[PDB]
């Protein structure tokens, strides 16, 4: 634009989009598993992926990935939702925080232990 | 902080002989002499040519390891140097070298910089007559750095000040072996320290 145009109409400041109505802009959210179930990924990948539909304190029911080999979530398990999507399950915008509320840690886990909510194993 | 854990193992990896044990890292032993390759299952394999990052990471790490200083303390020390007047590289060394734990090593009251830390920290050092136990303490031009009167005749201190009869202490300093006193005269010039460290690459590390 000419400077006069810029005077008259100016520049539109960007404005940008949450990936994550964990409402409020909370960093986490309590919810209850409504359904726990397995789903299949989008074309390139193939798996039986573990997700829970989750009804939230935030007023919203959404799906959420259950990370870790193995889990203990069932129909009313309480859960901490985390944010983070999965490039592979469409409309899974959130993860479940293992190690919190009714989400158990991941058993036998020994490497990336603090994700996966796993207590430091005893070196008896 | 001060790391705590195997040293003449980064006397290696940096691939260049720091002096973390003082006395042994002079014997046919600093492993630079024996095993001048990085630690671990690899180490003696084909060196892959370093990324521009690794070049600088290593240079930064080299310098830091030399003084036994936490990265948080180091970056701070560095950011202070940058704001300070004139050449950030040179100045930054001078600030590292102004440290009490290191001044004490440069005086040879202690063999290694680790040791100097432990001495300072245990009340054995005194600056201008009052006792200081803060390794990080900043030493200023004109300060008397002595050995505490009660500590004066300790096995380790006599050994160490016995070896200082003979030696020349770096030009920016004075030493009084008989009376166990030292004087920080001025800040170290960039050349007064023959450091195995291109400090200009360290500035560049912090530019990212």
């Amino acid at each position: 634009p000419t400077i006069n145009q810029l005077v008259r109409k100016g520049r539109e400041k960007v404005r940008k989009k949450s990936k994550v109505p964990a409402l409020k802009g909370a960093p986490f959210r309590r919810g209850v598993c409504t359904v726990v179930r397995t789903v299949t990924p989008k074309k390139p990948n193939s798996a039986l992926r573990k997700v829970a539909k989750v009804r939230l304190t935030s007023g919203y029911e959404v799906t959420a990935y259950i990370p870790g080999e193995g889990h203990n979530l069932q129909e009313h398990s309480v859960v901490l939702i985390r944010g983070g999507r999965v490039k592979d399950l469409p409309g899974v915008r959130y993860h479940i925080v293992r190690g919190v509320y009714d989400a158990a840690g991941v058993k036998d886990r020994k490497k990336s232990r603090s994700k996966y909510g796993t207590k430091k194993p005893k070196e008896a | 902080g001060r790391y705590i854990g195997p040293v003449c193992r980064l006397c290696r990896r940096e691939g260049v002989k720091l002096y973390l044990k003082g006395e042994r890292c002079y014997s046919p032993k600093c492993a630079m002499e024996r095993r001048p390759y990085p630690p671990g299952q690899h180490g003696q394999k084909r060196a892959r040519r370093p990324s521009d990052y690794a070049v600088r990471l290593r240079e930064k790490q080299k310098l830091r390891r030399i003084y036994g200083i936490s990265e948080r303390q180091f970056r701070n020390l560095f950011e202070e140097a940058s704001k300070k007047k004139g050449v950030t590289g040179s100045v930054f060394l001078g600030l590292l070298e102004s440290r009490l734990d290191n001044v004490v090593y440069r005086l040879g009251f202690a063999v290694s910089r680790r040791q100097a830390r432990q001495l300072v920290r245990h009340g054995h050092i005194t600056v201008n007559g009052r006792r200081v136990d803060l390794p990080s303490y900043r030493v200023r031009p004109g300060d008397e750095i002595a050995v505490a009167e009660k500590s004066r005749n300790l096995e380790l201190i006599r050994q160490n000040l016995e070896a200082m009869k003979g030696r020349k202490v770096g030009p920016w300093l004075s030493l009084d072996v008989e009376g166990m006193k030292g004087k920080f005269l001025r800040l170290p010039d960039r050349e007064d320290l023959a450091l195995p460290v291109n400090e200009q690459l360290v500035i560049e590390f912090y530019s990212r």
Binding site: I3, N4, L6, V7 | -
Partner: protein, 99 residues
């Protein structure tokens, strides 16, 4: 000091009041161009002495009504119906912006 402003009389439809239009110019805070904005001031004229086209110093004052906080200081020059016509064209053009 009491703020003095000068500008033209663009209305004298009121009793003992003239509407006085003040142009002013500032650099744009970001883009720097000198811009020209304008404000109208109701100005006390207790002796209905000022007429349309009069260019007048306006001076800050003890409130005289809601809106009126400026008396007419003096008459810089007279019959500038060109500046009056300008403002009225700007005003009449509004009739052609609605639905």
């Amino acid at each position: 000091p009491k703020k003095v402003l000068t500008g033209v009389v663009v209305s004298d439809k009121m009793q003992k009041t003239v509407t006085v239009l003040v142009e002013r110019q500032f650099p744009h805070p970001l883009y720097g161009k000198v811009i020209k904005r304008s404000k109208k001031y109701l100005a006390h004229d207790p002796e209905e002495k000022y007429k349309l086209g009069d260019v007048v110093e306006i001076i800050e004052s003890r409130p005289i009504s809601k809106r009126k906080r400026f008396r007419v200081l003096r008459l810089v020059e007279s019959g500038r119906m060109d500046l009056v016509e300008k403002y009225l064209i700007r005003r009449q053009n509004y009739e052609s912006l609605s639905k």
